[PDB]
Design a protein around this ligand. Structure first.
Ligand SMILES: [Cl-]
Ligand SMILES: [Cl-]
Ligand SMILES: [Cl-]
Length: 224
């Protein structure tokens, strides 16, 4: 997260850090006791044994409850940046309670409205190409950017109906490397997406691009 602030305890009861080979990697969202939603690119074709999930903590390295993976299912239409979601099943079920909770999801067929305020959270770099990552969870609030404006930024084919965009024209507030797969929420804390991709981080006139939960609910509901 670039231009972020510290997440408070219980801000995103469902957020998970996804470590790989013991180091930072991605984020995720706990859908239920044995299931995490993340970005396909966080996991697709990698050794599953490499991943560890941690829930119920603002730290990625200590506290809360952890789990290895039992399986990984990518979106059936995952291709390049498109349909960038994956369902992980957990080896160890994680109960709700305390600072752990399950995500509520954007309605099927919903699409974030331009100018509405979204909040995105992670343990990614606080600058583009940053090699140091914060221990504690950061968050930033940025407005939804219209698909039409985002297509003017990235090209028509680049931004699909299963993506939405968010950011500020000026830059300076965005998700970055290490934030992939983690939650972006509407003003109500409903899960609207997962961190997916973009042109660098926090650049003027290049929105963050997110995999749309509203657009990809059949996949999520079928395998959660
Ligand atoms: Cl047009
Ligand atoms: Cl602006
Ligand atoms: Cl779907």
């Amino acid at each position: 997260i670039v231009g972020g602030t510290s997440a408070s305890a219980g801000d995103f009861p469902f957020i998970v850090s996804i470590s790989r080979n013991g180091g930072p990697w991605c984020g995720g969202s706990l859908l239920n006791a044995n299931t995490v939603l993340t970005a396909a690119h966080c996991v697709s074709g990698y050794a599953q044994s490499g991943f560890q999930i941690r829930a119920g903590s603002l730290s990625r390295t200590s506290g809360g409850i952890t789990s290895s993976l039992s399986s990984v299912r990518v979106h059936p239409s995952y291709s390049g940046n498109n349909n960038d979601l994956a369902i992980l099943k957990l080896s160890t079920s994680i109960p709700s309670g305390g600072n752990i909770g399950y995500a509520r999801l954007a309605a099927s067929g919903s699409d974030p409205v331009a100018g509405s305020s979204a909040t995105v959270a992670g343990w990614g770099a606080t600058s583009e190409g940053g090699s140091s990552t914060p221990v504690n969870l950061l968050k930033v609030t940025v407005p939804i950017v219209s698909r039409a404006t985002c297509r003017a930024q990235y090209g028509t084919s680049a931004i699909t109906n299963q993506m939405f965009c968010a950011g500020v024209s000026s830059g300076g507030k965005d998700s970055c490397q290490g934030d992939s797969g983690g939650p972006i929420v509407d003003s109500s804390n409903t899960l609207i997406g997962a961190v997916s991709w973009g042109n660098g981080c926090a650049r003027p006139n290049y929105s963050g691009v997110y995999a749309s939960v509203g657009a990809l609910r059949s996949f999520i509901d079928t395998y959660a």
